[PDB]
Design a binder for this molecule. Structure first.
Ligand code: FES
Ligand SMILES: [Mg+2]
Ligand SMILES: [Mg+2]
Ligand SMILES: [Mg+2]
Ligand SMILES: [Mg+2]
Ligand SMILES: [Mg+2]
Ligand SMILES: [Mg+2]
Ligand SMILES: [Zn+2]
Lengths: 37, 278, 177, 50, 65, 37, 157
RNA sequence: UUACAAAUAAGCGCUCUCAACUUAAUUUAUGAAUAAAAUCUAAAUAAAAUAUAUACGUACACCCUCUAACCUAGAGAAGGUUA
């Protein structure tokens, strides 16, 4: 989890969710791609 | 005459006896602090121990759960018979109805409903048993007005190298910005003579003939001072009353007359052979 | 009219006991009503020097309701006065410890910031649930309308009421539902 | 100086007292203060707040 | 409602509320707390004042009708 | 009639009646000093 | 409405469905909301309207089945969340899978709740008069509803 | 052990020290919007999970004779004791 000002999808499998009051991109293939706002 | 009349509680319409159940709290005792002596265990280690003597401990007053605190009931227990000559009439009136001579101190014990005991019931040192951890509370020794060095362990100031009339003084009270002194700031004042509690003291041995409890370590207060002794409230010893006289120990029943001295297993009794670490 | 001097004065300045039900009510709206009666601002004879306030009894204060996310967003702050004695508690946490605290604090702020506010708070009686002491019940004169009309739940709606409302859309036959 | 300035303030404070007392009286019958005052004016009734 | 005929001067009602139970006449502290609860006031109201204020009070205040 | 206690209130109500029986009500017609005759 | 029955052999049986009240007041409306003149006249409190678009366990029905437009589908979805959070749908509670019981924690009464109470943090620095932090009430999606007040509704409390 | 070459005070001597209702990052389970054997949910939900803290316990409670004397109580006062 890197917290970034602007969140961007990084690969095809990346998907976006709204958990606990923030936007997350989570990638099953590459955990590196996980991001938080 | 009054004391003898209260010797046999079981033959004086005792309140119903209930079984022990988890979460129960028994009544405690008030004891006099005799002094200290060394005590040795079968492993050869030496333990300083304080001697607590129960003198004329009786239950005096009972308040139901509702009338004292919704959570639990209370019992008042007094010890150490005192003179009747320099006492207020209100205190003397209270004891006259109860049929007892006045006691030096009253303390309140939170006791569950099942463990309630009728007022006027004598309490004895055999209430506690060796192997039991206990909590003792008493007023600490009074040391009078004291400075910050002795009261709060302040370092002070150097003795030499030019210090001008500043050796045992407090330093800066606070910072200048707030323009005031914080409440609770540590300052010179009267030290000691406060109620303090010592937690988790083991009971090494009980003397039935003289009603002496042997408690590990130190107890607050001076010699000949009354203390309050009750089962330990520490979580580890949560339910120890399971194997102790649940309401209290009644000599009147005398199912088996107790030995003069009761010992803990680890304690090395005097008159035993010399300890050889074989 | 036609009374003697003292009975007339006694009647005019007598204090009344009112009942508020706080079930499903916002504390602020309850506070507005209670603060009005406590001061005596409901009387034409009101004067700030007359001490003409009334008794307000509020029940079901445990069952008050907040709009929005105020349960988790509204914070109550206190200081013991010692270093490190600053406490901040959310509305839900304060409600859990004391069911009656939220209503009392809302009313306290609404009363005038003077010495008479402390006296007025003595006339305020807050009970977490419907149970009231018998003596307080006998004093009661009137109950006050709830400031907020409580919306009904689905189960509360009668079968006739459901039919009255139209079926806006029809689910197709080939649906799992 | 306080007495002289209080002479002007006294008149304004009395009007505030009247409006509060009128609001209490009108609310007993279910009317807000603005509704009571303006609609009485619209009836050509010129009774003052005092 | 019918009047409750079975059981009255306001003094009698006052006396029962301010029953003398402990230590015969109570001190200022305990007495004032008893009075404050009965009349739903605070303790501060019941304490006396010094002689500056007592001598300032008018002997004959004006009376209207 | 009003009263601090029920007995006092009832006693006051007795006086309210007697006032309305002897025509001495508080809102009774004011005394007439007009007549020069 | 079709239900699946299992026996392995499993089959689905279609059942007759309750029919909509005939003759809508405003025919030619695309959305079912506008065929009854409800565009700006429903809120979270209107369980009777909201319940019709809800699955038995509280989920929203898909748009392609209800036929609502996107604008009104989002309003219904948001109103349903607020209705659920206000405890106005006691019979559409989540199904308990197995060996699960309700939390048993006492329920706080709330209404007009924009966000899930779990994920909303406390306002520790509330701010002064002009930097006051606002507590959101209601939903922005319902900003166009008919208002009977002199001034617009106070969303930020 | 160091003093008062006092009956005490000290440490360099000895003893005792504990529970967490409720919660953040984060991680699981059921599950719609979104046709899924999707999705941890600023959807309805069930949980686990820092440091905090006081819901929860200990301590305190008593109601007040006091010429005077004495006190391990103390500046004074207060407080304790009196066969
Ligand atoms: S209301 Fe008409 S398109 Fe939905
Ligand atoms: Mg030792
Ligand atoms: Mg001393
Ligand atoms: Mg030094
Ligand atoms: Mg020097
Ligand atoms: Mg300052
Ligand atoms: Mg003006
Ligand atoms: Zn990726």
């Amino acid at each position: 989890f890197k917290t970034k000002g602007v969140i961007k999808k990084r690969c095809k499998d990346c998907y976006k969710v709204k958990r606990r009051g923030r936007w997350f991109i989570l990638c099953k293939t590459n955990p590196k791609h996980k991001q938080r706002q | 005459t009054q004391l003898t009349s209260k010797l046999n509680p079981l033959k004086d319409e005792p309140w119903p006896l209930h079984p022990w159940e988890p979460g129960s709290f028994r009544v405690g005792l008030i004891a006099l602090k005799l002094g200290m002596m060394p005590l040795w265990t079968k492993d050869g280690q030496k333990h300083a121990v304080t001697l607590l003597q129960v003198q004329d401990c009786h239950v005096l007053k009972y308040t139901p759960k509702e009338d004292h605190n919704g959570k639990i009931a209370a019992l008042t227990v007094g010890g150490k018979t005192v003179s009747r000559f320099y006492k207020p009439d209100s205190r003397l009136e209270f004891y006259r109805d109860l049929g007892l001579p006045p006691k030096q101190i009253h303390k309140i014990f939170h006791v569950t409903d099942n463990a309630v005991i009728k007022p006027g019931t004598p309490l004895y040192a055999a209430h506690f048993r060796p192997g039991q951890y206990v909590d003792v509370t008493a007023k600490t020794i009074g040391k009078g007005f004291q400075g910050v060095m002795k009261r709060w362990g302040f370092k002070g100031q150097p003795a030499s190298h030019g210090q001008t009339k500043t050796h045992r003084r407090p330093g800066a009270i606070s910072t200048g910005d707030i323009a005031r002194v914080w409440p609770g700031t540590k300052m010179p004042g009267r030290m000691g003579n406060q109620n303090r509690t010592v937690y988790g003291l083991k009971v090494w041995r009980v003397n039935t003939k003289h009603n002496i409890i042997y408690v590990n370590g130190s107890v607050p207060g001076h010699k000949n001072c009354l203390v309050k002794i009750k089962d330990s409230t520490l979580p580890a010893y949560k339910d120890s009353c399971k194997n102790l006289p649940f309401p209290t120990y009644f000599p009147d029943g005398d199912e088996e007359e107790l030995p003069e001295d009761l010992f803990d297993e680890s304690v090395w009794q005097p008159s035993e052979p010399s300890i050889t670490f074989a | 009219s036609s009374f003697s001097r003292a009975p007339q004065q006694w009647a005019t300045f007598a204090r009344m006991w009112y009942l508020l039900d706080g079930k499903m009510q916002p504390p602020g709206k309850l506070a507005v009503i209670a603060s009005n009666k406590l001061q005596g601002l409901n009387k034409p004879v009101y004067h700030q020097l007359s001490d003409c306030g009334d008794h307000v009894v509020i029940i079901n204060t445990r069952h008050i309701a907040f709009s929005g996310n105020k349960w988790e967003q509204k914070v109550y702050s206190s200081h013991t006065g010692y270093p490190g004695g600053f406490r901040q508690v959310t509305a839900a946490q304060l409600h859990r410890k004391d069911p009656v605290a939220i209503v009392k604090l809302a009313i306290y702020g609404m009363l005038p910031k003077n010495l008479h506010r402390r006296t007025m708070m003595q006339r305020l009686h807050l009970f977490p649930d419907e149970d009231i002491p018998e003596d307080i019940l006998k004093n009661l004169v009137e109950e006050l309308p709830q400031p907020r009309r409580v919306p009904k739940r689905l189960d509360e709606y009668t079968q006739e009421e459901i039919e009255a409302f139209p079926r806006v859309w029809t689910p197709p036959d080939d649906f799992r539902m | 100086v306080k007495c002289t300035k209080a002479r002007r303030l006294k008149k304004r404070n009395l009007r505030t007292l009247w409006i509060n007392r009128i609001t209490a009286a009108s609310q007993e019958h279910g009317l807000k203060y603005p509704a009571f005052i303006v609609n009485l004016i619209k009836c050509q009734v010129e009774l003052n707040r005092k | 409602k019918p009047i409750p005929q079975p059981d009255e001067t306001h003094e009698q009602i006052l006396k029962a509320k301010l029953e003398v139970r402990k230590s015969k006449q109570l001190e200022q502290g305990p007495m004032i707390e008893q009075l404050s609860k009965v009349f739903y006031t605070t303790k501060h109201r019941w304490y006396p004042h010094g002689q500056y204020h007592n001598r300032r009070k008018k002997l004959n205040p004006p009376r209207d009708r | 009639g009003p009263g601090e206690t029920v007995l006092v209130a009832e006693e006051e109500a007795a006086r309210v009646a007697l006032r309305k029986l002897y025509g001495f009500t508080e809102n009774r017609r004011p005394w007439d000093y007009s007549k020069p005759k | 409405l079709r239900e699946v029955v299992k026996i392995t052999v499993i089959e689905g049986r279609i059942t007759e469905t309750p029919k909509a009240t005939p003759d809508p007041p405003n025919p030619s409306g695309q959305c079912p909301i506008c065929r009854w003149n409800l565009k700006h006249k429903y809120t979270y409190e209107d369980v009777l309207l909201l319940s019709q678009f809800i699955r038995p366990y509280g989920g929203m029905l898909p748009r392609r089945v209800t036929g609502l437009c996107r604008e009104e589908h989002r309003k219904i979805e948001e109103c349903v969340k607020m209705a659920h959070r206000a405890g106005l749908l006691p019979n559409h509670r989540p199904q308990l899978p197995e060996g699960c019981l309700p939390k048993d924690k006492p329920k706080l009464n709330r209404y007009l709740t924009r966000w899930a109470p779990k994920s909303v943090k406390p306002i520790y620095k509330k701010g002064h008069r002009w930097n006051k932090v606002g507590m959101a009430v209601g939903s922005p999606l319902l900003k166009d509803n008919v208002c009977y007040s002199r001034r617009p509704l106070k969303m930020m409390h």
